[PDB]
Amino acid sequence: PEQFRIRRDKRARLLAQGRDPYPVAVPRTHTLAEVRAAHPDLPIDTATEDIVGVAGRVIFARNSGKLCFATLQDGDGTQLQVMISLDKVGQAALDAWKADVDLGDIVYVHGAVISSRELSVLADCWRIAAKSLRPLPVKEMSEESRVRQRYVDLIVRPEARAVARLRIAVVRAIRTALQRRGFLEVETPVLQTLAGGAAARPFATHSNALDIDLYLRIAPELFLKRCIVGGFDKVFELNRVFRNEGDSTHSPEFSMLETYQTYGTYDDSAVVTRELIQEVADEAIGTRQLPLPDGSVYDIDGEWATIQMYPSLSVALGEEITPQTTVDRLRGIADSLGLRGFGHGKLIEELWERTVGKSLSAPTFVKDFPVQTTPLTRQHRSIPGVTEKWDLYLRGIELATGYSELSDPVVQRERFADQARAAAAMVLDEDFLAALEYGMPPCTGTGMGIDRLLMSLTGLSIRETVLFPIV
Amino acid sequence: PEQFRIRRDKRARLLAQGRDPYPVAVPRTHTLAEVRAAHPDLPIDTATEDIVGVAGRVIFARNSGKLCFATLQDGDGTQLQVMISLDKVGQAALDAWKADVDLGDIVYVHGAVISSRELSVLADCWRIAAKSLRPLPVKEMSEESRVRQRYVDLIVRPEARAVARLRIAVVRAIRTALQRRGFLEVETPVLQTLAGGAAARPFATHSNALDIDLYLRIAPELFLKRCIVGGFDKVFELNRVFRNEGDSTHSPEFSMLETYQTYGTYDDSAVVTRELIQEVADEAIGTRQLPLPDGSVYDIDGEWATIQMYPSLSVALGEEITPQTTVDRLRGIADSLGLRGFGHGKLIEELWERTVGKSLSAPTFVKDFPVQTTPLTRQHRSIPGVTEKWDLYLRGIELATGYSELSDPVVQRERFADQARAAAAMVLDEDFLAALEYGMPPCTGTGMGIDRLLMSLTGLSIRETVLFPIV
Numbered sequence: 001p002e003q004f005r006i007r008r009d010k011r012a013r014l015l016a017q018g019r020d021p022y023p024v025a026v027p028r029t030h031t032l033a034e035v036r037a038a039h040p041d042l043p044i045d046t047a048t049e050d051i052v053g054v055a056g057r058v059i060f061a062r063n064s065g066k067l068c069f070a071t072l073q074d075g076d077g078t079q080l081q082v083m084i085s086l087d088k089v090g091q092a093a094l095d096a097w098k099a100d101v102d103l104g105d106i107v108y109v110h111g112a113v114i115s116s117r118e119l120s121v122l123a124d125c126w127r128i129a130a131k132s133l134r135p136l137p138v139k140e141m142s143e144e145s146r147v148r149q150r151y152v153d154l155i156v157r158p159e160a161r162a163v164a165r166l167r168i169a170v171v172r173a174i175r176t177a178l179q180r181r182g183f184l185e186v187e188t189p190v191l192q193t194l195a196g197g198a199a200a201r202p203f204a205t206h207s208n209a210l211d212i213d214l215y216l217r218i219a220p221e222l223f224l225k226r227c228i229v230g231g232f233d234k235v236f237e238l239n240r241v242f243r244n245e246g247d248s249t250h251s252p253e254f255s256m257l258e259t260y261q262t263y264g265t266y267d268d269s270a271v272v273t274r275e276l277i278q279e280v281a282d283e284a285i286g287t288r289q290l291p292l293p294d295g296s297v298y299d300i301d302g303e304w305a306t307i308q309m310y311p312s313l314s315v316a317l318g319e320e321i322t323p324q325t326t327v328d329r330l331r332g333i334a335d336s337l338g339l340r341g342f343g344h345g346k347l348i349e350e351l352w353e354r355t356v357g358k359s360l361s362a363p364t365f366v367k368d369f370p371v372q373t374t375p376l377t378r379q380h381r382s383i384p385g386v387t388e389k390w391d392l393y394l395r396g397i398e399l400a401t402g403y404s405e406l407s408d409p410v411v412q413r414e415r416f417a418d419q420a421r422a423a424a425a426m427v428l429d430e431d432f433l434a435a436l437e438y439g440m441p442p443c444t445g446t447g448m449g450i451d452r453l454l455m456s457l458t459g460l461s462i463r464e465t466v467l468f469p470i471v
Numbered sequence: 472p473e474q475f476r477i478r479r480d481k482r483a484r485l486l487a488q489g490r491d492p493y494p495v496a497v498p499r500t501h502t503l504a505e506v507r508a509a510h511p512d513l514p515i516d517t518a519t520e521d522i523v524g525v526a527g528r529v530i531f532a533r534n535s536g537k538l539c540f541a542t543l544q545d546g547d548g549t550q551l552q553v554m555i556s557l558d559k560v561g562q563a564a565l566d567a568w569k570a571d572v573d574l575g576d577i578v579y580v581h582g583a584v585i586s587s588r589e590l591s592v593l594a595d596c597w598r599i600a601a602k603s604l605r606p607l608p609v610k611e612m613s614e615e616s617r618v619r620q621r622y623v624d625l626i627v628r629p630e631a632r633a634v635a636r637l638r639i640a641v642v643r644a645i646r647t648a649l650q651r652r653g654f655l656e657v658e659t660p661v662l663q664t665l666a667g668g669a670a671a672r673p674f675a676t677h678s679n680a681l682d683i684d685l686y687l688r689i690a691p692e693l694f695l696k697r698c699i700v701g702g703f704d705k706v707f708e709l710n711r712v713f714r715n716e717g718d719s720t721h722s723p724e725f726s727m728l729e730t731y732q733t734y735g736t737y738d739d740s741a742v743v744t745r746e747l748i749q750e751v752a753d754e755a756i757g758t759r760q761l762p763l764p765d766g767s768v769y770d771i772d773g774e775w776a777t778i779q780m781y782p783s784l785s786v787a788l789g790e791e792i793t794p795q796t797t798v799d800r801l802r803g804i805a806d807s808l809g810l811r812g813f814g815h816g817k818l819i820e821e822l823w824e825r826t827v828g829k830s831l832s833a834p835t836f837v838k839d840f841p842v843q844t845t846p847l848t849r850q851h852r853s854i855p856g857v858t859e860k861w862d863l864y865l866r867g868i869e870l871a872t873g874y875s876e877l878s879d880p881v882v883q884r885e886r887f888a889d890q891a892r893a894a895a896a897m898v899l900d901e902d903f904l905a906a907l908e909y910g911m912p913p914c915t916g917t918g919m920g921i922d923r924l925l926m927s928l929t930g931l932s933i934r935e936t937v938l939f940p941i942v
């Protein structure tokens with residue numbers, strides 16, 4: 001905080017001297033990566049006649065009488081050395097360098113590209129591009145200091161830079177994979193008169209303009225389905241959803257992909273989802289043999305096994321479990337395993353996750369879900385009491401879901417009435433039901449969180465994968 | 472509502488007969504546009520041996536004894552005729568067609584591609600893909616009925632389909648224009664502990680997980696600037712912002728582009744913005760001679776004039792107006808023109824919009840703004856009392872803004888303290904100021920609303936350009 005005071009004094013002194021420590025422009029000719037790419041093998045201790053204008057954050061300084069060295073680091077982490085020499089710039093210029101420049105300062109330098117006894121610019125000219133009032137921390141940054149000051153994390157930790165660029169490359173890879181298949185990206189409302197399309201409690205805000213509460217969307221699904229009714233063949237939306245969470249490690253704001261494809265079933269969207277994930281790994285990561293932080297390697301290449309929920313649970317419990325199995329039977333199994341109340345569907349999913357889910361290692365689709373827990377998904381084409389839903393588990397993590405969508409408006413109203421009754425202490429989404437009543441062609445939806453994808457591919461947590469986590 | 476009851480009866484009858492009016496799948500081989508593209512000139516009244524599976528919404532029907540014709544319309548508005556003939560399908564099939572199929576119903580038909588005495592499929596086979604419980608309206612759709620039921624608007628009005636696809640093509644064109652220049656797209660928070668980076672009242676919501684109010688972002692600007700400090704060279708974010716409006720025709724939710732570029736000034740971002748807009752028109756519209764709904768044509772090709780606010784206002788008022796001109800002088804001019812209170816900057820902008828702004832027709836940049844109204848923009852490099860801001864007016868509409876960004880953390884704190892004092896009845900964004908104190912390289916930001924862009928290019932209002940406007 002004394003170092004704060006001295007940097008603040010240098011700013012005021014620089015101003016007073018008619019020097020400008022926040023100039024509007026410096027004439028930067030090249031990024032440092034550009035200069036590096038244009039001199040891959042310069043014979044050591046040799047000079048060239050490529051004059052450049054570079055700019056960079058001084059991350060290392062090493063002074064003497066007649067010659068000061070610094071490492072400039074460009075924003076991407078590329079480095080170039082500058083040398084401030086009595087012979088080439090003023091004695092005044094050299095003294096100003098020594099008096100004026102601190103670690104963290106952004107500096108412009110103009111000069112000739114050379115190699116040292118290390119690629120360097122021997123300066124004719126330099127100025128401050130931006131005076132840092134706070135010194136950089138060093139081996140001096142806690143996990144939650146990183147998240148409270150991502151801007152400092154990105155300056156000092158190369159891994160923060162690579163994670164930031166990987167998320168961007170992953171999101172781009174997804175847009176590329178879907179646009180190549182003819183998906184159009186749509187923008188549906190964030191503020192809704194009622195938030196539907198998932199199981200979660202909404203955030204409420206007061207509209208001045210309508211003197212009512214509006215709800216931040218929990219999911220785009222009901223609006224994307226209106227797009228299907230409207231004649232979109234292939235649609236997706238990649239954007240924030242909001243779940244007002246209470247005792248939770250799941251973030252209240254997170255980026256979600258949803259896709260809808262007409263004249264396909266959950267079987268089709270299962271294939272597309274595998275291909276999309278494999279294409280994202282190829283584009284953004286460069287391999288399907290994923291390196292993890294424990295030094296392990298997770299293979300997502302080839303075909304992925306599919307299992308059914310009721311059969312795989314039957315095999316794990318050693319008895320036949322079906323959509324007919326009573327709640328009292330299932331409650332007794334749950335008790336025997338040491339586990340708003342008891343529902344057939346909720347018990348099937350809980351016992352499945354507890355017995356089969358925890359065991360899964362290779363990438364696996366589980367399909368054919370209980371009707372009670374899948375209000376928006378079509379009843380199975382041949383199997384009584386299940387719906388056409390899959391969940392994809394990749395490296396143990398619940399990653400993605402796909403459905404053969406319910407288009408029958410009368411079944412859909414019944415399912416919403418069941419839900420409305422069950423949480424009564426009861427208005428339905430009548431506009432959504434109205435859209436289904438105009439006719440929705442058969443279609444398949446998917447959902448996949450971007451942070452879950454990055455975690456499944458890399459082992460990084462939500463606190464590493466989102467630029468600016470809540471705090 | 473009787474037509475509702477009859478459609479509902481046909482659904483129940485179809486179910487009872489073991490027929491499925493919402494089948495999970497039909498085997499569609501081709502889109503209708505595909506079939507059209509594969510038979511551009513079939514000699515009229517001739518048969519081919521291309522069997523197809525098509526599916527489409529029956530938008531026109533014309534029945535007889537032995538032969539029923541229908542127009543299927545694919546989601547994109549492409550049409551193909553089907554012919555249901557006693558000779559090729561059952562007598563039973565023909566009667567079921569007549570009894571079972573209504574306008575708005577989605578129907579699959581399998582058969583041979585032929586031309587009529589008009590491109591058609593002569594059916595071997597048909598089924599319902601989705602039974603419509605509500606008939607389509609016709610010349611029967613009010614402007615706010617269109618917006619309350621966009622899904623019906625997209626079915627019946629080709630222009631709704633073309634506007635929906637144009638917005639998507641414009642947003643894609645922008646991503647393409649910025650990615651081609653090396654801009655990375657980032658995701659910054661929507662929910663903030665305090666909403667900054669623009670002049671507007673925020674929406675508030677209660678966090679359960681933190682028992683505090685959070686604020687929906689009014690702008691990404693302060694987080695994008697943290698990205699610049701963090702070493703991003705070129706960043707953009709294309710996403711919703713939220714302004715809690717009261718007496719307003721400006722929407723509470725709207726999609727905004729912001730871009731930031733290091734080592735450029737407002738002069739650089741002015742060029743990029745023109746090029747970006749011209750590239751968007753080229754990609755999404757196909758011309759720079761923009762057709763408007765009044766039949767007029769607006770030319771956005773070539774170079775755009777730039778004017779300065781103080782000089783252009785001086786010429787319009789017939790006296791020299793400068794950053795020194797007093798509020799009392801300006802108040803008197805405002806009165807003479809028949810116009811939380813009186814500020815020098817607010818009066819300059821109001822008199823400029825009233826005298827020069829209203830006159831502009833050709834695309835025009837106005838630059839060099841009053842310091843009081845531009846708290847985040849750098850003081851001008853040579854002109855005392857103005858900031859490096861431009862506003863672009865295109866076809867009379869205020870479209871876009873660009874700034875030479877303020878990086879001086881001490882000037883920035885002063886400007887925030889001025890604002891905080893002026894609305895006191897006073898906490899600053901200390902984390903944002905902290906980021907500037909680590910050092911932000913010189914950079915230029917822009918802002919441009921997607922609905923304003925579409926309006927400036929097309930003459931369409933916000934109620935036409937957003938898929939699902941609030942209602």
Ligand SMILES: N[C@@H](CCCC[NH3+])C(=O)O
Nearest residue numbers: 197198219221445446447
């Ligand atoms: N709305 C779902 C994703 C789409 C699944 C298919 N309709 C969710 O929040 O998980």
Ligand SMILES: N[C@@H](CCCC[NH3+])C(=O)O
Nearest residue numbers: 668669690692916917918
């Ligand atoms: N935050 C500005 C846009 C960016 C202008 C350059 N910093 C706005 O809401 O208009």
